A paper describes a structure:
Boron, essential for plant growth, necessitates precise regulation due to its potential toxicity. This regulation is achieved by borate transporters (BORs), which are homologous to the SLC4 family. The Arabidopsis thaliana Bor1 (AtBor1) transporter from clade I undergoes slow regulation through degradation and translational suppression, but its potential for fast regulation via direct activity modulation was unclear. Our findings show that AtBor1 is regulated by two distinct mechanisms: an autoinhibitory domain at the carboxyl terminus obstructs the substrate pathway via conserved salt bridges, and phosphorylation of Thr410 allows interaction with a positively charged pocket at the cytosolic face, essential for borate transport.
Residue numbers in the entry: 5 to 267, 278 to 431, 440 to 516
């Protein structure tokens, strides 16, 4: 717990894999788009829902534009100078709850009111940034190492329950009347309300089930490998588009709003000095709560994306990441947008998608090399050496760790068997000798953040998405927030 020690160590570690990060990201060509698109959807949909929730709960002060811009800018800055580019930054539910509490507090004060809410929030963000700077400088993130696997599994389960509760609440609200829309409307009759609720159930469950099914496309006996990979990669975005199209089928026999549909930044510094100084000090309290929450969430989200099972080859940056989070919180407060923060399950989902990308790249390369070798000599031990050489050649040269390397050829595999091709199937055998590796780089995070930003200018296209799609996706992400963690497995076994 020495001042500035952790930050300096983290910077030392990360500054020697920076150009490597960028060149590795560019090494993959357009194949980097699949994880990028997957994480872009996973980041944009919850943020848009949170933006709608804040617009309803803040009388139009904060909308989806602000949440999207915060997510995009914070993500881009973290991608370029972050320290741990696996982390995905976004506006989380606890932030929404705290901002709702703050808005409710400020609406009941004649001194603050509604036209000074953003300025008071900015002062809260200044206090939070100061607290985060103090915590990072003192190495308070060292206690993160102490928290064990259960301390992260419980948080994952809590986030899963929160996402499921959000999905169920959205589905139930599809059955009720909104508190802001015109009450005397054709689309809001009890019969049409029941119809809307049932249609939303159909669409949400259809999206959930089809996406969960298409997530297993690669392990199918039908179709071609190209089509199987395309489905396994883009099924959830494709399902979003397909169920959006399905929602338009009955449009010739229903009222306008059946089903219900969805719908830069500025500065608040000038009016930030108009807040009386009894609430600038009073911002310390919600600032303390938000600082503790962010200290916990950023760290746990970063460590859940850095599981030992992924065999990552680059160091962690907990202290430096917390310092940068302080800076980003200060910037977001000055810009009048809610702060971003490391979020789950987006971060582990990003890590898993990158691991899958590396696995597929390696499988393609090794299959090609094995097929090339089968024709020439194919001695089954000289071909394994060729595959090992290709694996080593593909890898990126670093200084910290070394590539895991292909694992041992199983005794049963050799006992079963130049090499006879009838008795040695490459597709069956490659999977048995591929390690778990992650394609670590900064390009996927940067592109996902830029896409989230461009969603700001793509609002008319976003106007065509029903909210049932959002609730189905929230359920899909809640299930993704327990992708087979040890704690959930143990609960299943009991």
């Amino acid at each position: 717990f020495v001042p500035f020690e952790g930050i300096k160590n983290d910077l030392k570690g990360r500054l020697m894999c920076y150009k490597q990060d960028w060149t590795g990201g560019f090494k993959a060509g357009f194949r980097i788009l699949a994880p990028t698109t997957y994480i872009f959807f996973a980041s944009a949909i919850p943020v848009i829902s949170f933006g709608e929730q804040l617009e309803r709960s803040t009388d139009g002060v904060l909308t989806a534009v602000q949440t999207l811009a915060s997510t995009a800018i914070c993500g881009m800055i973290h991608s370029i100078i972050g320290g741990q580019p696996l982390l995905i930054l976004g506006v989380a539910e606890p932030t929404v709850i705290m901002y709702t509490f703050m808005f409710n507090f400020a609406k009941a004060r004649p001194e603050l009111g509604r036209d000074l809410f953003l300025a008071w929030s900015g002062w809260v963000c200044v206090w939070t940034a100061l607290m985060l700077f103090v915590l990072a400088i003192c190495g308070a993130c060292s206690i993160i190492n102490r928290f064990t696997r259960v301390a992260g599994e419980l948080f994952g389960l809590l986030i899963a329950m929160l996402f499921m509760q959000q999905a169920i609440k959205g589905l139930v609200d599809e059955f009720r009347i909104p508190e802001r829309e015109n009450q005397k409307l054709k689309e809001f009759l009890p019969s049409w309300r029941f119809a809307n609720g049932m249609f939303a159930l159909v669409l949400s469950f259809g999206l959930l089930l089809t996406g969960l099914r298409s997530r297993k496309a690669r392990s199918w006996r039908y179709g071609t490998g190209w089509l199987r990979s395309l489905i396994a990669d883009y099924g959830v975005p494709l399902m979003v588009l397909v169920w959006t199209g399905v929602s338009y089928i009955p449009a010739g026999d229903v009222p306008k709003g059946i089903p219900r549909r969805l719908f830069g930044n500025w500065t608040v510094v000038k009016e930030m000095l108009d807040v009386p100084i009894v609430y600038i000090i009073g911002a310390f309290i919600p600032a303390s709560m938000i600082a503790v929450l962010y200290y916990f969430d950023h760290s746990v989200a970063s460590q859940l994306a850095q599981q030992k099972e992924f065999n990552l080859r680059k160091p962690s940056s907990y202290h430096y990441d917390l310092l940068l989070l302080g800076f980003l919180t200060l910037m977001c407060g000055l810009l009048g947008v809610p702060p971003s923060n490391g979020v789950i399950p987006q971060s582990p989902m990003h890590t898993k998608s990158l691991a899958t990308l590396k696995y597929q790249l390696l499988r393609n390369r090794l299959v090609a090399t094995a097929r090339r070798s089968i024709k020439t000599n194919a001695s089954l031990g000289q071909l394994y050496d060729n595959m090992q050489e290709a694996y080593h050649h593909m890898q990126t040269p670093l200084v910290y760790q070394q590539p895991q390397g292909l694992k041992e050829l199983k005794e049963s595999t050799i006992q079963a068997t130049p090499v006879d091709e009838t008795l040695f199937d490459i597709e069956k055998e490659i999977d048995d000798l591929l390690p778990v590796e992650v394609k670590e780089q900064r390009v996927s995070n940067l592109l996902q953040s830029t896409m989230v930003g461009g969603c700001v200018a793509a609002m008319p296209i976003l106007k065509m998405i029903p909210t049932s799609v959002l609730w189905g996706y929230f359920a899909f992400m809640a299930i993704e927030s327990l992708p087979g963690n040890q704690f959930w497995e143990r609960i299943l076994l009991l």
